[PDB]
Design a protein around this nucleic acid. Sequence first.
RNA 1: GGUUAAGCGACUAAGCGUACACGGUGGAUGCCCUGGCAGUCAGAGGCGAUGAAGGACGUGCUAAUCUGCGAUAAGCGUCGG
RNA 2: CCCGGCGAGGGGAGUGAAAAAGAACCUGAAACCGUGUACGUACAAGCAGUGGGAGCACGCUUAGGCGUGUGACUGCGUACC
RNA 3: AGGACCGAACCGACUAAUGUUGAAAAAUUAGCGGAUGACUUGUGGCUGGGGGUGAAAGGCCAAUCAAACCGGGAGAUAGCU
RNA 4: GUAACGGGGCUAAACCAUGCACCGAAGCUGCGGCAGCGACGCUUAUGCGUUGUUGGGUAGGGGAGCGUUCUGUAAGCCUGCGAAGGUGUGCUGUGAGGCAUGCUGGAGGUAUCAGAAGUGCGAAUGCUGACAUAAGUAACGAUAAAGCGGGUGAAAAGCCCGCUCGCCGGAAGACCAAGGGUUCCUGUCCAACGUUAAUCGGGGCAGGGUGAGUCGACCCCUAAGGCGAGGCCGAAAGGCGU
RNA 5: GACGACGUUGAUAGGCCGGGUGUGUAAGCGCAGCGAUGCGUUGAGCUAACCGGUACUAAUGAACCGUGAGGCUUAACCUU
Lengths: 46, 56, 110
Amino acid sequence: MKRTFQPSVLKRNRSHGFRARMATKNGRQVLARRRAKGRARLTVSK
Amino acid sequence: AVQQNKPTRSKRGMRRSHDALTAVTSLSVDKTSGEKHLRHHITADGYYRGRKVIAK
Amino acid sequence: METIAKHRHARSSAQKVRLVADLIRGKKVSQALDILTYTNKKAAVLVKKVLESAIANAEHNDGADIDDLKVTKIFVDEGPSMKRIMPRAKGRADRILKRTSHITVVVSDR
RNA sequence: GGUUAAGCGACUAAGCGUACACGGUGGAUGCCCUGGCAGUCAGAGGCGAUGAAGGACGUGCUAAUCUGCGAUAAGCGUCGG
RNA sequence: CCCGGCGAGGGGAGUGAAAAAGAACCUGAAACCGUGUACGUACAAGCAGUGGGAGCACGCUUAGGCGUGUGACUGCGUACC
RNA sequence: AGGACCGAACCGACUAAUGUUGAAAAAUUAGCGGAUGACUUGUGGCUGGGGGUGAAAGGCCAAUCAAACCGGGAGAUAGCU
RNA sequence: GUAACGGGGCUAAACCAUGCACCGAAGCUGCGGCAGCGACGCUUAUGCGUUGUUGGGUAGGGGAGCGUUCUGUAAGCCUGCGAAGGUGUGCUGUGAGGCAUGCUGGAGGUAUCAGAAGUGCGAAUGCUGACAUAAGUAACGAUAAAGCGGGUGAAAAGCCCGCUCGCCGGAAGACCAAGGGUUCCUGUCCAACGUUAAUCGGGGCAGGGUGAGUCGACCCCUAAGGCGAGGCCGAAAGGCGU
RNA sequence: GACGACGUUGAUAGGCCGGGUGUGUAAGCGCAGCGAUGCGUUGAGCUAACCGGUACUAAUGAACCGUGAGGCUUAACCUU
C-alpha cells in the first residue's frame, strides 16, 4: 500500500528548510524556540 | 481459549513428570577395535561387527 | 577432595539443560561421558565440556584420579535474559526472552 | 518346627507439598556526592556592520568524541604574576 | 599453569584487609527459578486454614514424658476490597 | 469517425474463500470492470481549520475529521465513578 | 438424577396427652486478668482499702498513643574490640512496637526532653522497573525442490568447488532517476544481529575503492508559481503587486 | 505411546525367481508403399501395494533392568 511519507529532498527543504523558516516572522520564532531549547539540529537542512 | 486462574508450580511440575529423558541402557562393543558404539550403528573409526566397514 | 567447574551465561534455557543434568547426577564420570556422547541434544554438548573441564581441574590442581571420580552435585541456575522485539500483526510488538543458564558441575572421589 | 486357610499389615514416589540449609536471578534498602532546588549580601544589567546570538567545516605525533582554538588554527606577541 | 574452538566461560596461582570486592564489580532485600536433607502424599472431593491429634525425624535431657520440623485421621469452616 | 467493440500493460475493486495475536493496522488467490479517454501517470506548484476541496459520501485535508495536528489558557469543569 | 423427613432408616425413631431426667449458645454462674464511668473514705501533692456498674458496632464524633525522616539538646554519648542496612533466634508489652544477640556488612549512628513533617499503602482497568503464567505450547513469512561427492573447519542440510535436478525469463534478467548514503571490493572475527546451525552475510574490526573540455549538475533561457526596490492598501503584525 | 509378528536354530522387510493382474502387439530389424503409415517377428514389451517361493541384503555376540525362598497373629492339620 502507498504510505504517507514519499521523500523528496527538494520539497523537504522548500517546506521546512532554514531559508523557508527565516523568511517569515513565525518561522524565525520557530528557530528561536529551538535555539532556546538547545536543539542540535534546528532544521532539516542537511 | 485462555485461563481464568494462574496455574501453580505444582501443576507445572506434574505436567513435566513425563518430560524426562531416557539414557541409553548400554553401549555395544566391537569385536576387533573394542570401541564403544550404538547398537546396530557403526563406530566413529568406521568398524562394525569387526569387518572394517567404511572408514573413508 | 571436591572440584568445581562452571559455564556461566550459556545460550540455552535452564529448563532444557536440566533435562540432561538429571541423567548424570550421581553417576561415575566414565558413565556420564558415554551418556552425554549419545544424547541427541545441544545441552549435552555444553554439559560435556563442563564435565570435561572439572575432570581436568581435579587432575591438574587437586592431583586426583579419574577412575575414582563421580558426579556428586550438578545444577542449572537461571541466568540473565536478553530482551528483543518481535514484530507481530497489526503494529503490535511482542517481547522475546533469549534465556541463558549457569551450568555448574561438581566431581569428587568420596 | 512344617503345610493350608482366615484376618491384619509396613517398606514404593513418576511427581508434588511444607520446613530448613546452600545458591541463582533481580537491583530494593542503607551509606556516599564534583549534580540539582530555594534564597541572602554584593556585582553586572546588555551583545551586534570593528560582523552578534547560534552554528557548519576544520585544527594534534591523533582514528573518534568532548574541550579549546581558527589556515598564525589545544594556539602567536607583549607587559606582569 | 590447566580444560576449552590460538574461543566464550571457568578452575588454580598471585595481588589485596577483603576477589562470596574481578571490572555483568559497595551493601545485595522481595517476587521468581533451582540443588540437597527431614517428614508427608498415588480410595481420596471443595477459600486449603483453625481446634484436636497419632506416628516419624532431630535437639535437649544430671531418663525428667520439654522444644523444633512434618501433619495420617478428625470437628468447624464459601477469599479481600 | 467513435466519452465505439474484444482484450494485455496500466488504472480500478463486483463476488467468493483464506487470513482476522494475519505475510499485510484492508492484503492474498481464483474470477470481475474500464482500457483514445469526463483516461492514466512522473516532477514541481497553489488552495489552511468554522477554513480548504468535494461528478456530494458529511467524503478527503500525513494510518486522526459533524470541525486536523502541536503548544498554550490548564491542575478547564465534573452535584458522576 | 432417588430429589415434597437433611440422609440412613423407623410401624415407632409417627401423632395426642401426662410426667420425670439429660443434651444444648460467645446467655447465666465459677476462677484469673485489663480497661472505662460512677459514687465512697475531702480521702490526698492520689492511689486505693474498697465499692457497684459498664465494655458488639458501619457512617461519624471524642480521647490516648506507636513508629518513620529532619532541627536543637550534641565538638555530648555509641562505634573498626565492628555503625546503618540485610538475615535469623530469643525475650517482652493490651496493640501500633520494643530490647538483646548470632551470621552478613564494613562506616557511620544517636539517648532523653522538646520542635517541624514530602510521616505509615493490597486495592484507584493506579505509575516505573523486575519476574511469573499460559509453554518449551503457537509460530519460524508464499507448496519455485532439492540430491550426492569433495574441500575447509572444533563442528557442515544451509559456506566454497563440481556433476545433476527444479524455478523466473515483457522477469524473479540488465541499465537509471527518486530516495538511501559505504550497504561496493579484500582480509579477518562469530559474542550480539540473521526467526535454526553457521566456517557464511547487506553483521563486527581494519584497509582499500568513486579519475570527465564531450555523461549529469552548476551555468544561459524561461513555464506554473514564489519573492518583490519604489508603490497601493491595511490597528500593529502584515497583504497585493510594478 | 500402545498392540501384534520376527531377529540367523531365521521368510520380519526389501530385493530376486516364478506366476497372476493391468495395459494392449515395445524397441530393433525386415517387407510393402513416393510418403504419412501399415504388416510380420508379437497378445509383444512393460507391469505398484497381490499370490506362491527364495537368506542375496539388513535384522550381531553381548550389555541393561529384574534376585538369592518371600511379615506378624490365630485356628485347623503333619502329630485325624
